[PDB]
Amino acid sequence: SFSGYLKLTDNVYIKNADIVEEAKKVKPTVVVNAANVYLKHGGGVAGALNKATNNAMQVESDDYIATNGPLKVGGSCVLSGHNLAKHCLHVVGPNVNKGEDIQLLKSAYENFNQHEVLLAPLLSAGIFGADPIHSLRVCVDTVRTNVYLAVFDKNLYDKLVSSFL
Ligand SMILES: NC(=O)c1cnc(C(F)(F)F)nc1
């Protein structure tokens, strides 16, 4: 199972780790992708997860979008986890660099409650532009299921742990 995580709350754990390397090691039931509405996995966590699947995630995602259309900001879909996990839960947090409503971050985290355990990044953090301290706060106050957060950046991980209320 998950190792080396710091326990933040009854159900939220955190580790300074590359979510791709973490997924390859744990092979969790669910890995969360920091997706956009088009499932265009170009950069950030999405680009990294997709590259690890040798682009199979993007091929599957394009077929999903061709059939279903785009996701909503705050929404999700369950697709294959490929070589990384049983499933990938593609969750769209608001991208504040695209002027999206930060209030939708709670709706985005609510998707995690449909899965008993997940390996996840902080939603809307990184290239999505939100404050990761705020994202962790919304995560702990919204997610009730077991969430193992992988924070790529060591300096950000230390700031998140040291400032956690
Ligand atoms: N394995 C990678 O190449 C990798 C790159 N970038 C990231 C990011 F975006 F979370 F920081 N995580 C992993």
From Swiss-Prot:
Subcellular location: Host endoplasmic reticulum membrane
Catalytic activities: Thiol-dependent hydrolysis of ester, thioester, amide, peptide and isopeptide bonds formed by the C-terminal Gly of ubiquitin (a 76-residue protein attached to proteins as an intracellular targeting signal)
Result for mutant: T29A: In strain: Mu/B.1.621
Topology versus the membrane: Multi-pass membrane protein
Mutagenesis or variant effect for S162L: In strain: Gamma/P.1
Superkingdom of this protein's organism: Viruses
Regulation affecting activity: Inhibited in vitro by GRL-0617.
Residue span(s) of domain Macro: 1-165
Role noted for this protein: Responsible for the cleavages located at the N-terminus of the replicase polyprotein. Participates together with nsp4 in the assembly of virally-induced cytoplasmic double-membrane vesicles necessary for viral replication. Antagonizes innate immune induction of type I interferon by blocking the phosphorylation, dimerization and subsequent nuclear translocation of host IRF3. Also prevents host NF-kappa-B signaling. In addition, PL-PRO possesses a deubiquitinating/deISGylating activity and processes both 'Lys-48'- and 'Lys-63'-linked polyubiquitin chains from cellular substrates.
Subunit organization: May form homohexamers. Interacts with N protein.
This protein's name: Papain-like protease nsp3
Organism expressing this protein natively: Severe acute respiratory syndrome coronavirus 2 (2019-nCoV)
Gene assigned in the entry: rep
